[PDB]
Amino acid sequence: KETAAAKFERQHMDSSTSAASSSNYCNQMMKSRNLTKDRCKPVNTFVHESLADVQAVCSQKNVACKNGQTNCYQSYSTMSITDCRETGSSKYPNCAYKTTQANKHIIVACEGNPYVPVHFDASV
Template sequence: MGLEKSLMLFPLLVLVLGLVQPSLGRESSAMKFERQHMDSAGTGSSPTYCNQMMMRREMTNGSCKPVNTFVHEPLAHVHAACSQKNVTCKNGKGNCYKSSSALHITDCRLKGNSKYPNCDYQTSNYQKRIIVACEGNPYVPVHLDASV
């Protein structure tokens, strides 16, 4: 009888695991934001910083991401932007917010003659405010919309 129950429950277990498993390895939007944009410990001062970081953060897999910005501030400072004055995002959505102060950032721009797999980036450092799109509960950055 115990074996019969186990055999009856097995298909149900397979169904549940099939539904749950794909989401286990999926990167959340907030985690992707951190991977692509946060480097609290870095300074971005090396001319090869962007080449190294874009590769390390998996933004040169299959193609070269044309533009990316790294923020060199504590994550809490970036999260704080989500409680600032609301601004319209570039895509017209209303979930963007501008940081209250300028932050240390590094812009990485793909050089014109650069082609995959040899992605070559120009590294530029700035002190600028950032505009981030925020979502979720807790309300956290999920997209870096601009630096101004």
């Protein structure tokens, strides 16, 4: 079945663009990455960086995850990210989102060997 590492790439990586190019980014990306298949996922963050740069976070500043877990890491530098948040008109299967683009630090949880990001925790 899809690995946690793969799933992380599928849900949160967008190395193909430097930023969201329009208000529709979320709507299109959420659908294409299959995040709306079973239900409308309420929030999602896409990271506009190379895989290598994001995998490197696992070796940066160790911080506690929102749930208390201790395998989270915060990026030393800001990163280009797009936040997607479901809108008040969103209604499965027609999931709808608001697109917000920014440059922020990312916090990820890492696991495995190679030790890579498997969950997106927050941006700061």
